[PDB]
Amino acid sequence: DVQKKTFTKWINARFSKSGKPPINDMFTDLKDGRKLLDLLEGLTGTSLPKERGSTRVHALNNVNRVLQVLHQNNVELVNIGGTDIVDGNHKLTLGLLWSIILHWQVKDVMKDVMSDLQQTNSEKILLSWVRQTTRPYSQVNVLNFTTSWTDGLAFNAVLHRHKPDLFSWDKVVKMSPIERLEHAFSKAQTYLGIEKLLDPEDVAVRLPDKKSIIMYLTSLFEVLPQ
């Protein structure tokens, strides 16, 4: 309804901005597949075959190429197929457009957004990762990259979460902070190739070195499974 007006505008914007004519009704002019074929051509800088006949067959044919392409671009659609679009299914016609917008714009833009974010909110964005990763683990609460890692619990939680068959979590909560670390470091080492950068005596202290933690933490993460 609203998504109509705006999606129509957006597509029409895409069109005008490249010498191509606009459409009137988005649940019509879109059916025969032609327009969507244009949209994708301009969007991809590619040449796409267009069937000229004005009969259902061709409509389905064109719309199939459209979907075909999206698929080629790793943009698969849930319950959508030629006929849907060819027939004017409101719900799904939009759902398709949005898929395009989402892939070529919205998602595209995110790479840049991260670059802008990656220089400033680095340390902060990595903390919300660890918090989310070790959420399930009750006895683990990470607020920073210093004290929250002293009891050595947080270090294991990170490992465990993505390979619980590696060791017993309850078995850990039992051992001392020193064991808890000697362990994690040893585990990560044997099963992840990650070198034992830190030493327990170094991490189990009032204020442990922030840079050293983050550097080991990032080491772990690189080779971590998800």
Instruction: Specify if 54 maps to a domain.
Output: yes
Q: CA-to-CA distance for 141 and 114, rounded, in angstroms?
A: 26
Same domain, 148 and 65: no
Q: CA-to-CA distance for 141 and 145, rounded, in angstroms?
A: 11
CA dihedral of 74, 64, 88, 33, whole degrees rounded to 10: 100
Same domain, 94 and 126: no
Method used to obtain the model: X-ray
Same domain, 198 and 126: yes
Q: CA-to-CA distance for 193 and 38, rounded, in angstroms?
A: 50
Of 57, 73, 100, the position where a domain reaches its end is 100
Instruction: Specify if 112 maps to a domain.
Output: no
What proportions of the chain, in percent to the nearest 5, are helix, strand and coil? 65, 0, 35
Domain count along the chain: 2
* Axis-axis angle for helices 2-16, 34-44 (nearest 10): 60
| Look-up of token digits 């607020």 | 143
Q: Are 54 and 32 in contact (CB under 8 A)?
A: yes
* Axis-axis angle for helices 122-133, 210-222 (nearest 10): 60
Instruction: Specify if 160 maps to a domain.
Output: yes
Instruction: Specify if 114 maps to a domain.
Output: no
What is the three-class DSSP state of 182? helix
Buried b (16+ CB within 10 A) or exposed e, 111-134: eeeeeeeeeeeeeeeebeebeebb
CA dihedral of 183, 189, 195, 201, whole degrees rounded to 10: 0
Instruction: Specify if 158 maps to a domain.
Output: yes
Cβ-based burial of 85 (10 A; exposed 0-12, middle 13-18, buried ≥19) = buried
Same domain, 75 and 126: no
Domain that holds residue 150: 119-221
Instruction: Specify if 226 maps to a domain.
Output: no
Instruction: Specify if 42 maps to a domain.
Output: yes
CATH for 11: 1.10.418.10
What are the C-alpha distances in Å from 128 to residues 132, 176, 222? 6, 26, 17
Long-range contacts, stretch 111-114, CB < 8 angstroms, 24+ apart: none
Instruction: Specify if 169 maps to a domain.
Output: yes
Q: CA-to-CA distance for 172 and 157, rounded, in angstroms?
A: 9
Same domain, 124 and 45: no
